């Protein structure tokens, strides 16, 4: 889908790291799975694996957080809540928004 592939292209551009960004898998069924590490902390280190089914952004993406500078107990809170404005930014490409939403943020403030 055009909006989705444009989002994928933009994300692939926004990051010009070395190990930034990867497309883990592509398929007509089940959709696209990709990985981003985006870095954030300054005081009191992120791997975000998004899954985009062929219904996204009308549907919810599958997420997962690894960040072994952080504990793991948060990752369930953070996945069960990066999920929220994911429901707010529903029906439209939300990945970029979430990504930049959380280097602002470590369930801070």
């Amino acid at each position: 889908a055009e909006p989705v592939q444009e989002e994928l292209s933009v994300l692939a551009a926004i990051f010009c790291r070395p190990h930034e960004w990867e497309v883990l898998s592509r398929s007509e069924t089940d959709g696209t799975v990709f990985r981003i590490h985006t870095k954030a902390e300054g005081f009191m280190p992120l791997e975000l694996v998004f899954h985009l089914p062929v219904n996204y952004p009308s549907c919810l993406p599958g997420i997962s957080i690894n960040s072994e500078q952080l504990t793991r107990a948060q990752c369930v809170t953070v996945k069960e809540k990066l999920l929220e404005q994911a429901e707010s930014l529903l029906s439209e490409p939300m990945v970029h928004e979430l990504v930049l939403w959380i280097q602002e943020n470590l369930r801070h403030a």
């Binding site: 692939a12 551009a13 926004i14």
Partner: protein
């Protein structure tokens, strides 16, 4: 210093797709590898109606420096246009598009394109960039609008 820029261009894009003025085009070009070039855009500006620029759609390329958005984009018409404020290279001579002047980081791509569209029928006497267009514009405006209408017809789909 490319991070703030690539992100900013990315704020520009989805806001543009969600809402943008009618007849206007602003699209980032796409790389051969399959990535997106946000620093380079292919845009189009429609001629205002009630004017000699009417029925016309005029194409221009937008280029962003790495220090964007504190620097302005370089806006170049391709093909180059017949206008008093457009260089033979197609570069647009505008006050808000130059840093030491009226450029602000707050200026949106939309605001730029609108300002240029305004400039189309309202040339600035203080910014001569093209000899022929400027001179004819001052000397015989009937003939000038003759050229504008022919050019507008050339770029009408």
């Amino acid at each position: 210093m490319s991070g703030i820029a690539l992100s900013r261009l990315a704020q520009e894009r989805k806001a543009w797709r969600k809402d943008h003025p009618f007849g206007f085009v602003a699209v980032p070009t796409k790389n051969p590898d399959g990535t997106m070039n946000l620093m380079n855009w292919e845009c189009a500006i429609p001629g205002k109606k009630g004017t000699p620029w009417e029925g016309g759609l005029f194409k221009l390329r937008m280029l962003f420096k790495d220090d964007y958005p504190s620097s302005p984009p370089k806006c170049k018409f391709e093909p180059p246009l017949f206008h008093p404020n457009v260089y033979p290279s197609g570069t647009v001579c505008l006050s808000i598009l130059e840093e030491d002047k009226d450029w602000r980081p707050a200026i949106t791509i939309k605001q730029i394109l609108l300002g240029i569209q305004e400039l189309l029928n309202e040339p600035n006497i203080q910014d001569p960039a093209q000899a022929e267009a400027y001179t004819i514009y001052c000397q015989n405006r009937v003939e000038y609008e003759k050229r504008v209408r022919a050019q507008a017809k050339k770029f009408a789909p």
